């Protein structure tokens, strides 16, 4: 069912995360971590302190899909185990240095064709698939987007609820 999912999403904040490649999303799904540009890292750290759940909704550029969504379980931290991200053309790993811990809520994909009816007020009411990396998604749009994903029966949200 969807009741624990709705509980986790209650009063949450939502951010669109754009990866240039599948490799980084696969690494994030395997290791429970994410890193972003410093401009976005500052926004996510502020959001983590301000809301009961901060949700990252992932999309690999040019894939036409979202690849899942996850909840921040920490602010960003440096000096942990290194993560072998595939780095965009220009600038090095010092940029992607802050590491957030995340708990996956859904590792299933959702094609953009299924979210065409959702627009994001914080991006000019453009379709929610449209947005830069780090674009915040308004509460109602983000909740409905997450509820469109196929259920991920491998996930138990009991442990996430306890972290709140
Ligand atoms: C592990 N993190 C990543 O792959 C990643 C890459 C980005 C980028 C946003 C805008 C770019 C030119 S690059 N934001 N996050």
Is 71 in a helix, a strand, or coil? strand
Mutate to test the pocket of ligand 1, among 26, 28, 36 (most ligand atoms within 8 A of CB): 36
Strand partners, 104: 70
Find how far residue 124's CA is from the centre of its chain.
Answer: 20
Nearest CA to ligand 1 atom 4: 19
- Between the CA of 148 and the centroid of ligand 1 the distance, in Å, is 25
- Between the CA of 21 and the centroid of ligand 1 the distance, in Å, is 9
Binding site for RNA: what residues are annotated?
18-20, 34-35, 85, 133
- Between the CA of 20 and the centroid of ligand 1 the distance, in Å, is 7
Name every residue whose Cβ is closer than 8 Å to that of residue 36 and which is 6 or more positions away in sequence: 17, 44, 96, 98, 100, 133, 134
38 lines ligand 1 (CB under 6 A): no
135 lines ligand 1 (CB under 6 A): no
**Do 9 and 146 touch, CB atoms closer than 8 A?**
yes
Say what the resolution is, in angstroms: 1.4
Task: Sheet with 136-137: list strands edge to edge.
Answer: 33-34, 100-106, 68-72, 54-60, 13-19, 136-137
Q: What Å distances lie between residue 63 and 13, 19, 66, 101, 117, CA to CA?
A: 24, 10, 8, 25, 19
- Between the CA of 95 and the centroid of ligand 1 the distance, in Å, is 10
């Amino acid at each position: 069912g969807t009741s624990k999912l709705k509980y986790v999403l209650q009063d949450a904040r939502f951010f669109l995360i754009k990866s240039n490649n599948h490799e980084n999303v696969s690494l994030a799904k395997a290791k429970g971590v994410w890193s972003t540009l410093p401009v976005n890292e500052k926004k996510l750290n502020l959001a983590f302190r301000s809301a009961r759940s901060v949700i990252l909704i992932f999309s690999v550029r040019e894939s036409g899909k979202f690849q899942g969504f996850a909840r921040l379980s920490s602010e960003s931290h440096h000096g942990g185990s290194p993560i072998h991200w595939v780095l965009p053309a220009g600038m090095s790993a010092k940029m992607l240095g802050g590491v957030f811990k995340i708990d996956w809520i859904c590792r299933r994909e959702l094609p953009f064709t299924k979210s065409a009816h959702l627009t994001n007020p914080w991006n000019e009411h453009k379709p929610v698939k449209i947005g830069r990396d780090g674009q915040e998604i308004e509460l109602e749009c983000g909740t409905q987007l997450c509820l469109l994903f196929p259920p991920d029966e491998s996930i138990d949200l009991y442990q996430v609820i306890h972290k709140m």
